[PDB]
Structure 1
């Protein structure tokens, strides 16, 4: 009925959180996804320690993690999620042992182990996507202190190393910076900062975000952009005639690929990352356009020139 990824995520969440897992709330789904990502990375208390190449401080931290008691049945997670008595069985069964590599399992040839490893990888990817979307959503109302200049903002979202490894094309941070500054191999993926990520309640159901869906402004914006992206993206929403909290998606932005404004260095000149910015002009900057694909057709919506976070804050006033 559903692809492997969503089926495995649903099975894992249902097994670990029982009947307390709300399937229509973004916050609950995000909390469950984050907890599952922590469990599957061998990060919950009472799991195998990471000591392969650990510095003494890391050795001490991992030993303390190992010694501590694991989460007990009925522990409260998030806001309305309660672990069931049978989460330990799921953790012991469906979580690959620390250091497991697909090559070793394939060499062994156990079909069940290969299936479990594939499920674990799919769950890692799905939870990474959900957590990236949640980071975007949080960035719409709460600015991150780390981002203070466009250079820093270029690497949002900031997530752990395993988060970058699972979905290199969406996750930024320290590891994305290191990969970009380092040698770019055959597997290098450029950070697609503004990729479309359907809401968590649609991500686990497979309903791709498209026109006609009834969603909120904040959820849609976190799906198609983040806090500091331009405000014109708010045009992708239209309040309904009822309560108005949940509206309708009318059109989605189009990833611009029309023209390139670079100027490569030649004959002693110097490169220009953007012709408009370095021109010290303002007339063009205030009359830019964004290509929104609507039901009727493409439309050029003039940019508002103010952050999405500030636009939302002003509107809420």
Structure 2
């Protein structure tokens, strides 16, 4: 009885990858979501060209992409995902035509087209959530080249324009910088670099990340923070019997998504919600990336 949001994603993944899509591996799910996102944004080879207002270089790139041979059944997308012959039918029937606007579909009154557009929007949102989680997971051990100062680190993740369009609240980068460094409308969302995003293996099944579920330290750290967040967040994970790179979540920090403040610096604490109750844990003063590097060996 999953929400239609996740049901559409599961159906699309099954139709495009068949049985090669493993619904238990985070990397496989992330790769499948990225492929579906780039398919639904009309970015794959052989798809329609983005030439509404493209410049010379962009026009040439789009023309080359259109002329380039499209992916065929049996192609390897990632490490453990293989496309199926049904991918062409799914792309032709589910992906809205380039430039389609929901207002026109609603005005037309066609129930099927309205459903298709709603499912496409939901799939874009889910895929961008998975992409943001994967970006956090990647940055936990390998930081971006553009991130040099707090000014640069304030706009992580550095996702593309479509990513920002789908999830402006979670996505950062250049377009988030533009939106923040500019006029703000009523429907303006603040970039929450630490919004809780359950791991994709949990997201695609609707499970809510909570205390008592088996996850990895990197999994939890990428769910509730990213590479340059403070290392105290590591206290939210506790190794199980024998460790084995799998532990359990003991809490989730409060004030994760929102915050406004309008010796002592290292004496700051973070609130953690535990089964017994809220506790305050002293900060460590070092970023999660640096702490993981130091504890690696």
TM-score scaled by length of structure 2? 0.97
| Contact 2:15 2:86 survives alignment (8 Å) | yes
Q: Matched residue of 1:300: which SS?
A: strand
| Contact 2:254 2:273 survives alignment (8 Å) | yes
Spell out, residue by residue over 1:231-283, the C-alpha distance to the aligned partner (whole angstroms, 9 max, x if none): 0000001100134311010111011799965xxxxxxxxxxxxxxxxxxxxx1
| Contact 1:213 1:249 survives alignment (8 Å) | yes
Q: Which 5+ residue runs of structure 1 have no aligned equivalent?
A: 262-282
| Stretches (4+) displaced over 6 A | 256-259
* Aligned match of 2:134: 134
Spell out, residue by residue over 1:6-39, the C-alpha distance to the aligned partner (whole angstroms, 9 max, x if none): 0000000000000000000000000000000000
Cα RMSD over matched residues? 1.3
Spell out, residue by residue over 1:22-79, the C-alpha distance to the aligned partner (whole angstroms, 9 max, x if none): 0000000000000000000000000110111111211111111111110011000111
CA displacement at 1:316 relative to structure 2? 1.5
| Contact 1:214 1:246 survives alignment (8 Å) | yes
Select the structure of larger CA radius of gyration.
1
Change in Cα spacing, 1:256 to 1:27, as seen in structure 2 (3 Å) is closer
Spell out, residue by residue over 1:103-125, the C-alpha distance to the aligned partner (whole angstroms, 9 max, x if none): 11011110000000000000000
How far apart in 1 are the matches of 2:259 and 2:198? Answer: 28
Spell out, residue by residue over 1:291-315, the C-alpha distance to the aligned partner (whole angstroms, 9 max, x if none): 0011111111000000101111111
* Aligned match of 1:51: 51
Change in Cα spacing, 1:75 to 1:207, as seen in structure 2 (3 Å) is same
How far apart in 1 are the matches of 2:246 and 2:115? Answer: 40
| Contact 1:256 1:291 survives alignment (8 Å) | no
| Contact 2:192 2:258 survives alignment (8 Å) | no
How far apart in 2 are the matches of 1:104 and 1:257? Answer: 35
Confirm whether residue 298 of structure 1 aligns to residue 278 of structure 2: yes
Change in Cα spacing, 1:199 to 1:258, as seen in structure 2 (3 Å) is closer
Change in Cα spacing, 1:213 to 1:42, as seen in structure 2 (3 Å) is same
Change in Cα spacing, 1:259 to 1:94, as seen in structure 2 (3 Å) is closer
* Aligned match of 1:312: 292
How far apart in 2 are the matches of 1:148 and 1:316? Answer: 23
CA displacement at 1:170 relative to structure 2? 0.2
How far apart in 1 are the matches of 2:271 and 2:278? Answer: 6
Q: Matched residue of 1:106: which SS?
A: helix
CA displacement at 1:143 relative to structure 2? 1.3
How far apart in 2 are the matches of 1:177 and 1:88? Answer: 37
| Contact 2:195 2:256 survives alignment (8 Å) | no
| Contact 2:211 2:250 survives alignment (8 Å) | yes
| Contact 1:15 1:86 survives alignment (8 Å) | yes
